[PDB]
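request received
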Amino acid sequence: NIMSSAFYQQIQQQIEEVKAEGLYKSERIITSQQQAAVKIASGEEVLNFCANNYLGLANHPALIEAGKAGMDEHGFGMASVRFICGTQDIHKELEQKLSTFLGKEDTILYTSCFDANAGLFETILDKEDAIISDALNHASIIDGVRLCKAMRFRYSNNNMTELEEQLIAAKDAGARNILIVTDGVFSMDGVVANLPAICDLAEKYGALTMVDDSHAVGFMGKTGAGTHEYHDVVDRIDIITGTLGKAMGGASGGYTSGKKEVIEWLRQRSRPYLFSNSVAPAIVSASIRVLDLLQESGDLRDRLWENATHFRTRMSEAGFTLAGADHAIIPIMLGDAKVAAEFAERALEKGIYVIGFSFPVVPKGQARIRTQMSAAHSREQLDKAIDAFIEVGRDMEIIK
Amino acid sequence: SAFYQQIQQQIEEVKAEGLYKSERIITSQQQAAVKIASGEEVLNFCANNYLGLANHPALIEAGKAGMDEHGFGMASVRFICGTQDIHKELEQKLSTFLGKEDTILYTSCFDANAGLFETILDKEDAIISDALNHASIIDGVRLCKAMRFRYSNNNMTELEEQLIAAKDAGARNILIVTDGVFSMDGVVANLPAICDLAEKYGALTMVDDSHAVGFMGKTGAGTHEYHDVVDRIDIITGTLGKAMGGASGGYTSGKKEVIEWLRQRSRPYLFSNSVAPAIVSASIRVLDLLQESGDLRDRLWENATHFRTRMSEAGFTLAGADHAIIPIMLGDAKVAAEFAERALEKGIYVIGFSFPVVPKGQARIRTQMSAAHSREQLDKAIDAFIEVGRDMEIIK
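response:
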């Protein structure tokens, strides 16, 4: 164990360095269900303002009942990849309902959106082709691109001038197919990508468009279809990826959605789909339930946006600087990494659970609390959180 | 457009090669007797449902209770607000079951493998792989900047050669990576020989035990238990989606330093949803159930032994040893395809594999044994296989 001990010592020193930078990630143990007021292992009840539980569906009674029913009817697991003996009728039903929900022809299910992105680019593009990425894209997009042999281009976040430049450079380089790839929502900023301008440029230069809409599906756009609906470009986004693990229920599951040809080819060749278990029947059944629950009413979306508007009003009037527009992610900009860490700790002492981010996750000097709104927050819970944030900021001499 | 035309032509080319994958629509639970959309009921001999847990009432009850106590989803990655007490409980129980210090959960073993190598190894290091390793291992290695060496399947001579080559190239850390079971052959990896070579050359060892956890070794802990090298395998990955229940979920298990570093840096763990509480709760139950009774494992190995006896005695050639995967070796791809078609006509659902999945001239039916098969069901399937083999003039 002299070589193995050298290896473990190396890792332990890396861990110690992470702790020294103030960047060590600790897990808070929740003993309750995911919801607005969670219980943690200390015994305290705290208001959760850092979940992707945007419509409060993670503990919604309709989903729990549909998950149980799905287990009674379709069992606990498939124990197979889809093409061997892992496909049930409900997998196809879910894929059809997602396709219509999103305004696309077909949908392919994965056990995560991480895998949907990882399994996309290498399957549809090769060295003859080009991928043009927004510089701020999500890590699963980055890793999918890394498996792909296509030429890679990057444009600065949300910068349509650099996107046009890179489209020209891609044309000049001889690209057969060109794919522009963007997150639909930049999740550290709460900024929705500029889909109209991207679609104009793709149409001008003959490029395909792909949007990862994980942080938008369920509540962006009138019917909650996503940012392509929000920006009225539904038929101009060629490929959409997304997750069931955020607003759409919160368990797990991801998908790719698009033209029948692309989806059929992914079923034939996408490696995560070929080599990983089919999605669990309880999750498939609950997600079918979700899509119906979301077409029944726009009530949950309405509560989400009322909360978001109220939060911006009260927090900005108290003197906080808030990032982004038109999304449930509303970061409190604090600049200094130690200040952000202290703010989160003081918020916890007042019963509010938030998470802070700093470099390298966000730029140096632009540290922030990534507050996330949720339809699960009652107006009183939301006002209690805002009250606590104001008290913390006054205690810390950040606001007057 | 040109792109959609190109894609459609690739599809057509695949259909023309006879390589197109079709999905059979199952309308029942996963079990020995499944119903397909045609309305037929068929005996399923191609699932990874090795202990019949995929529809076991205890898992369904534990999953429902897990939803009542811990909800439907976490809607968060683990480090933000995705960690429940039951996630930590499952990791501790897996750790004790596998004989390792700590365990980190992923939503699939596909992601556990993808999230492993680049997190612990870089260009100064080397990875030495068995040539037959699973695709998620290959894809995890592709994200890793370490030097790559490959040895032919199960070949300890080429492994020693590649260890020497890795030493010669100046490798700082060296990781030998193998599937625990080569899943087209039903062959258990030669862990004793690997560990000897790793000790001799100063290498770490990693085993993907996805096709073994739950039923290999005395407690079902895996191939490291089967080969009595539990403390000599440094890193173990595995899945909950095969013998351990069949829903989804994967994990990496090993020394506390490595697992902690994975929690800090493994990209699928940082950027993908925490595992759904129903699956965590059911898996906690599975780990108790499998130590409470060895009946399911016993039924599995009884079926396996009976299948090998009746099928060898009828004249079939069968691959592997000591595993639930018992391939019928048929050599010729058209013969294997016809065999699967004829078996289906008699109510048995099997899958055949041929090149590029297995070598040319070594096409096979990948029959998978299961505790879910009753003795009567297994005998009906064996009867059908023998009738098919006689109809096809493969056996007398």
